[PDB]
Amino acid sequence: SPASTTLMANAIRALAMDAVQQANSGHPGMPMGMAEIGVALWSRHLKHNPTNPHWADRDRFVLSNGHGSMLLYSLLHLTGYDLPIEELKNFRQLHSKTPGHPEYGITPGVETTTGPLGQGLANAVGMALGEALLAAEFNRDDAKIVDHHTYVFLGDGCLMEGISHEACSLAGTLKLNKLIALYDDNGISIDGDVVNWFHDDTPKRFEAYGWNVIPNVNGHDVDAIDAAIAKAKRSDKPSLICCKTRIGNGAATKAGGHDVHGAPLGADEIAKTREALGWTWAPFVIPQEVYAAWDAKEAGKRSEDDWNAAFAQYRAKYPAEAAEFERRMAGTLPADWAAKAAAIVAGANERGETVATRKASQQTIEGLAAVLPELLGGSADLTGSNLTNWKASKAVRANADGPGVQWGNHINYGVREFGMSAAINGLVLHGGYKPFGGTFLTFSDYSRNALRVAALMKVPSIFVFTHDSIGLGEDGPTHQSVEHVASLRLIPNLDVWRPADTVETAVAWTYAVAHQHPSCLIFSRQNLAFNARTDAQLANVEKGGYVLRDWDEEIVARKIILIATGSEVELAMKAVEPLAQQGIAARVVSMPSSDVFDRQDAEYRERVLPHGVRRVAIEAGVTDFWRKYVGLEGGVVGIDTFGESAPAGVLFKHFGFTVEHVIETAKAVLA
């Protein structure tokens, strides 16, 4: 007898309930509820190769309800990915390939890192947009190389989160019809029956976004779910399949209950569940016929083999394009990257312009685009204000007459910071593009956890933020960042650049673009003075903090270091001659990135900030951050309150960003 769908689904049940029991921790409800959905999608529709999780044209799957991780670990194991049974035995254990929520980079087949509800859905919107752009860009009438679907499992949690609204409204407007969402519709969240706090007509909601909805599907009928996916694959709109399930389905006593979401079933309940399901095998034992029914290694090999032959036929007709496709899918920059980056930094230096760093950024974007065809910019409805767009770009737009998008390389995201940012994580994960997205610095508070997840996954998302201080002027304290620059530096693995002029901007951008981890690039509204640099100083900008103005040789005056960033570098420099007329010799250290500076070696950090010489930090943001560089004995010229609505000039004088206050602070520090 070969395996029935019931036996295939019950294997998921058994692995889930057993792994959770073993760890005494985790979530058996969702995996047990979603088991028939897993069979229908994975065994009948998903195009993938377990032997090569990196195959360019694989379907992308995302588990947005990430707490149900054992569902993904079961499917991966059963269908033949390199995730052995011993790894499932070590669910939720230190250094296992089975962490409590799935982690990209940790486990083969895991496309993104989930756990924070709602972000998977948005990642998946990004992945579908990437497929759609990459298809419009690379496919030719006589040779197709891009064609895959994007699948996402999600629950009540993701649908309640505001980010689902941002993502799905945008996906509906852009007609991303190869995105197919399967909703685990089980009527229950952690607090109990969802109807008491979440009574949406969800089908009607998604129709309003311009999605196709298949409501009221029996989530325990494989054939019905299978049929719903097949209809979805014929749809001219993104689809939502509402799969009515019972949470913890199959459990003897606890199914549909308020206690199966996120605690182990208990040994008795498992024993009773085994008998109720007729599942006779011991924990982590899977019978041969169950592996044989699930295993995807043969079909995965045929699929990738046909694709490789298709790509070979495409290379013969389109060799330059085929090589571009490979390079870009790998996330590799051009072979002559070092030359091309240097041309961009050098042009910034030749021009010697005094402009706002948001304008510097746009000038640098212009130069990047000319050599990076993968460049993909965008803004959360602040295009003309962030200056994220370039003259030769083309805006992404839905096709007027059918599904999908016309190719473009700049995206209007709408007023959707968080959705934009998690979409960018998706775009970066998909491969083929180098994406970035802008908003005002303070509204990093809206997209924050997406910046964090990018930093956790270690993918090189680029987040542009403009209007970075009181320097923005009249829009006032709701808009003026104070705490943000420092608060972003706190996130592990997230580089923060706050350049002082065109040259630092070109370095920040070129560095960010080549770096493996994500970056925040922070620009001013207001014009900042250009700084002339020697060759030695130019070479040191990329070290994050460097000596911009040194003391003269063999001097006699009392020494101070001024450490400044961004718009405050200008203030530090205007303070040098005045400090000298006061008997104080001021070195100016510019620190466009403290994160990068901290990675420099000890000899170099000691050369920039010599022990025993006192320091004043200068930055239009909270002061406490600076104590790591200035100590208890040092000073800081900064801002520890919210701002005020007035012109920038007025605000800078009001808040003590003046030569006089710098002098006074330096004198206090030297006393």
Do residues 496 and 489 lie in contact, with contact meaning Cβ atoms separated by under 8 Å? yes
**Which amino acid, one-letter code, is at 557?**
A
- The gap from C-alpha 238 to its chain's centroid, in whole angstroms, comes to 22
Q: What are phi and psi of 381, to 5 degrees?
A: 60, 35
- Cα distance between residue 325 and residue 319, in whole Å: 10
- Where do contacts with ligand TPP occur on this chain (CB under 6 A)? 29-30, 65, 67-68, 115-117, 155-158, 186, 188-190, 247, 261, 381-382, 415, 443, 446
Give the range of 70-78, 170-178, 483-491, 555-563 binding Br ion by CB under 5 A.
Answer: 555-563
- The gap from C-alpha 438 to its chain's centroid, in whole angstroms, comes to 13
Do residues 483 and 470 lie in contact, with contact meaning Cβ atoms separated by under 8 Å? no
Pick what 525 binds: ligand RP5, its own copies, ligand TPP, none; C-beta below 5 to 8 Å, kind-dependent: ligand RP5
What part of residues 419-458 is at the interface with Ca ion (CB under 5 A)?
A: none
What part of residues 125-164 is at the interface with Ca ion (CB under 5 A)?
A: 155-156
The answer to whether 27 is annotated as binding is yes
The answer to whether 558 is annotated as binding is no
The answer to whether 117 is annotated as binding is yes
Under the criterion CB under 6 A, does residue 385 sit at the interface with ligand RP5? yes
Under the criterion CB under 5 A, does residue 285 sit at the interface with Br ion? yes
Determine which helix (DSSP H) or strand (DSSP E) holds 180, and give its type and residue range.
Answer: strand 179-185
Residue 140 DSSP label = B
Identified catalytic residue from 103, 111, 131, 417: 417
- Cα distance between residue 619 and residue 334, in whole Å: 36
- Cα distance between residue 463 and residue 453, in whole Å: 13
Tokens 């003590």 appear where? Answer: 656
60-63 β-sheet, strand order? 60-63, 150-154, 179-185, 239-244, 212-218
Report helix, strand or coil for 374: coil
What part of residues 262-281 is at the interface with Br ion (CB under 5 A)?
A: 281
Instruction: Pick the binder of Ca ion from 107, 186, 383, 524 (CB under 5 A).
Output: 186
Pick what 559 binds: Br ion, ligand TPP, its own copies, none; C-beta below 5 to 8 Å, kind-dependent: Br ion
The answer to whether 84 is annotated as binding is no
Smallest distance, Å, CB 45 to its own copies?
Answer: 28
What part of residues 222-261 is at the interface with ligand RP5 (CB under 6 A)?
A: 261
- Cα distance between residue 595 and residue 488, in whole Å: 10
Nearest by Cα to 10 from 217, 293, 238? 293
Instruction: Pick the binder of Br ion from 94, 267, 282, 632 (CB under 5 A).
Output: 282
The answer to whether 147 is annotated as binding is no
What part of residues 50-109 is at the interface with its own copies (CB under 8 A)?
A: 66, 92-96, 99-101, 103
Do residues 635 and 669 lie in contact, with contact meaning Cβ atoms separated by under 8 Å? yes
3-state secondary structure labels for all residues of 394-423: CECEECCCCCCEECCCEEECCCCHHHHHHH
Instruction: Count residues near its own copies (CB under 8 A).
Output: 112
Under the criterion CB under 5 A, does residue 559 sit at the interface with Br ion? yes
Residue 58 DSSP label = S
Smallest distance, Å, CB 403 to its own copies?
Answer: 14
- Cα distance between residue 258 and residue 543, in whole Å: 54
Nearest by Cα to 41 from 278, 241, 238? 241
Pick what 261 binds: ligand RP5, Ca ion, its own copies, none; C-beta below 5 to 8 Å, kind-dependent: ligand RP5
Smallest distance, Å, CB 335 to ligand TPP?
Answer: 39
- Output 373 or 476, the one with its CB closest to ligand RP5: 476
What part of residues 16-75 is at the interface with ligand RP5 (CB under 6 A)?
A: 67
Asked if 417 is an active-site residue, the reply is yes
- Cα distance between residue 574 and residue 656, in whole Å: 14
Report CA-CA distances (Å) from 368 to 177, 340, 435, 519, 544.
31, 9, 12, 16, 21
Pick what 203 binds: Ca ion, Br ion, ligand RP5, none; C-beta below 5 to 8 Å, kind-dependent: none
Write out the binding residues: 27, 67, 115-117, 156-157, 186, 188, 261, 358, 385, 443, 467, 475, 479, 525
Write out the binding residues for Mg(2+): 156, 186, 188
Q: Which residues bind ligand RP5 (CB under 6 A)?
A: 67, 190, 261-262, 385, 475, 525
Q: Which residues bind Br ion (CB under 5 A)?
A: 192-193, 281-282, 285, 391-392, 558-559
Q: Catalytic residues, which ones?
A: 417
Q: Which residues bind Ca ion (CB under 5 A)?
A: 155-156, 186, 188
